[PDB]
Amino acid sequence: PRLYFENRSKFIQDQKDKGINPYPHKFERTISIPEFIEKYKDLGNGEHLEDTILNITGRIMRVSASGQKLRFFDLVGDGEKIQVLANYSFHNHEKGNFAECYDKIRRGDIVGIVGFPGKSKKGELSIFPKETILLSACLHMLPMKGLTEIRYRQRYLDLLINESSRHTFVTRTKIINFLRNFLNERGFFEVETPMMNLIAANARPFITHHNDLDLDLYLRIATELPLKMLIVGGIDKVYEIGKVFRNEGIDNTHNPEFTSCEFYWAYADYNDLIKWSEDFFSQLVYHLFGTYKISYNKDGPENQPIEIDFTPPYPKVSIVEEIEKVTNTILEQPFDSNETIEKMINIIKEHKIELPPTAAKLLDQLASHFIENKYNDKPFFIVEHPQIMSPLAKYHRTKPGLTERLEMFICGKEVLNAYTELNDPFKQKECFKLAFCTSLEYGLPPTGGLGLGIDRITMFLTNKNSIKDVILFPTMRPA
Amino acid sequence: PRLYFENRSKFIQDQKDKGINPYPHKFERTISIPEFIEKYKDLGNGEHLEDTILNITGRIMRVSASGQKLRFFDLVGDGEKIQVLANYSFHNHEKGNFAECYDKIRRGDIVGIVGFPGKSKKGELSIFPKETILLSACLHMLPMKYGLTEIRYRQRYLDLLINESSRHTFVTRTKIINFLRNFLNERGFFEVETPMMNLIAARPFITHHNDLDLDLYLRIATELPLKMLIVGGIDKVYEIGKVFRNEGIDNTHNPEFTSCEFYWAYADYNDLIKWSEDFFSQLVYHLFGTYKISYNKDGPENQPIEIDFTPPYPKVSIVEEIEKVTNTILEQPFDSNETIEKMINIIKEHKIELPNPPTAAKLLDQLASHFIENKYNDKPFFIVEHPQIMSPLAKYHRTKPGLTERLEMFICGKEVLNAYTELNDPFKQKECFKLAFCTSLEYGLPPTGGLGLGIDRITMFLTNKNSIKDVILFPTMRPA
Ligand SMILES: O=C(NCC1(O)CCCCC1)c1cc(=O)c2cc(F)ccc2o1
Ligand SMILES: O=C(NCC1(O)CCCCC1)c1cc(=O)c2cc(F)ccc2o1
Domains along chain A with CATH numbers: 1-145 (2.40.50.140), 146-474 (3.30.930.10)
Please measure the distance between the N-terminal and C-terminal CA atoms of chain B and give it in whole angstroms. Answer: 21
Q: How far is CA A128 from CA A83, A116, A220, A327, in A?
A: 9, 5, 55, 72
Asked whether B344 and B362 are in contact (CB, 8 A), the reply is no
Query: Is the Cβ–Cβ distance between B76 and B33 less than 8 Å?
Result: yes
Residue B180 CA to ligand 1 centre (angstroms): 29
Q: What is the resolution of this structure in A?
A: 2.2
Chain B hits for A428, Cβ within 8 Å: none
Taking the C-alpha atoms of residue A287 and residue A308, their distance in angstroms, rounded to an integer, is 16
In whole angstroms, give the CA distance from residue A452 to residue A277.
10
Q: How far apart are CA B228 and CA A154, in angstroms?
A: 9
- b or e along B62-77 (b: 16 or more beta carbons within 10 Å of the residue's beta carbon)? ebeeeeeeebbbbbbb
What number does the ligand 2 atom closest to the CA of B247 have? 19
Under a CB-based contact definition with an 8 Å cutoff, are residues A170 and A34 in contact?
A: no
In B, minimum Cα distance to A269 occurs at B26
d(CA B266, CA B233): 12
Q: Which of B161, B192, B258 is nearest to A191 (CA)?
A: B258
DSSP H or E stretch at residue B360: helix B360-371
Spell out a b/e string for B185-218, using b for 16 or more CB atoms within 10 Å of the CB, else e.
eeeebbbbbbbbbbeeeeebbbbebbeeebebbb
Between the CA of B200 and the centroid of ligand 1 the distance, in Å, is: 26
**Structural contact between residues A448 and A238, judged by C-beta atoms closer than 8 angstroms:** no
Residue B138 burial (CB count, 10 A): 20
8 Å CB contact between B393 and B386 = no
- How far is the C-alpha of A20 from the C-alpha of A16, rounded, in Å? 5
Closest ligand 1 atom number to CA of residue A261 = 9
Distance CA A39, CA A117 (A): 10
Q: Are A132 and A141 in contact (CB under 8 A)?
A: no
Q: Do B136 and A208 touch (CB under 8 A)?
A: no
Q: Give the bridge partners for B419, in sequence order.
A: B407, B451
A473 contacts B195? CB cut-off 8 A: yes
Method used to obtain the model: X-ray
Q: Which of B108, B197, B445 is opposite residue A136, by nearest beta carbon?
A: B445
Q: Read off the amino acid at residue A32.
A: S
Q: Ligand 1 atom 1: the closest Cα is on which residue?
A: A453
* B245 CA closest ligand 2 atom index: 19
* Cis peptide leading into residue B357 (ω within 30°): yes
- Tell me the three state secondary structure of residue A143: coil
CA distance B148 to B150: 9
For residue A405 and ligand 1, the question of a CB distance below 6 A is answered with: no
d(CA B202, CA A248): 28
Contact B29, B57 (CB under 8 A): yes
Residue B237 in 3-state DSSP?
strand
Nearest to A165 by CA among A179, A176, A177, A154: A154
* Cβ-defined contact of A12 to B59 (cutoff 8 Å): no
Q: Which residue puts its alpha carbon closest to atom 18 of ligand 2? A: B253
Helix, strand counts (H, E) of chain B = 13, 18
Count Cα neighbours of A468 within 13 Å in the Cβ-side half-sphere: 15
Q: Which amino acid would we find at residue A104?
A: K
Distance separating alpha carbons of residues B131 and B110, to the nearest angstrom: 14
CA distance A250 to A256: 7
Q: Do A267 and B29 lie within an 8 Å CB cutoff?
A: yes
User: How many interface pairs between A and B have CB atoms less than 8 angstroms apart?
Assistant: 268
Q: CA B166, CA B160: separation in Å to the nearest integer?
A: 6
Nearest atom within ligand 1 for CA of residue A257: 15
Q: Residue A204: nearest ligand to its CA?
A: 1
**Where do the H-state alpha helices sit in A62-162?**
98-103, 150-153, 155-161
CA A35 from centroid of its chain's CA atoms: 27
Pocket of ligand 2 (CB under 6 A): B 245, 247-248, 253-254, 257, 259, 415-418, 452-454, 456-457, 468
Q: In terms of CA atoms, which chain A residue is nearest residue B228?
A: A156
Q: Is the CB of A277 under 6 A from ligand 1?
A: no
> What is the whole-number distance in angstroms between the Cα of residue B457 and the centre of ligand 2?
8
Q: What angle do CA A6, A8, A10 make, to 5 degrees?
A: 75
Q: State how far the alpha carbon of B136 is from the alpha carbons of A332, A391, B21, B57, B247, in Å.
A: 33, 19, 10, 11, 42
A316 vs A377, B110, B208, B250, B387, CA distance in Å?
14, 32, 41, 52, 64
Give CA–CA dist B405/B399, Å, rounded. 10
CA A388 / ligand 2 centre spacing (Å): 45
Tell me, what DSSP letter sits at residue B30? -
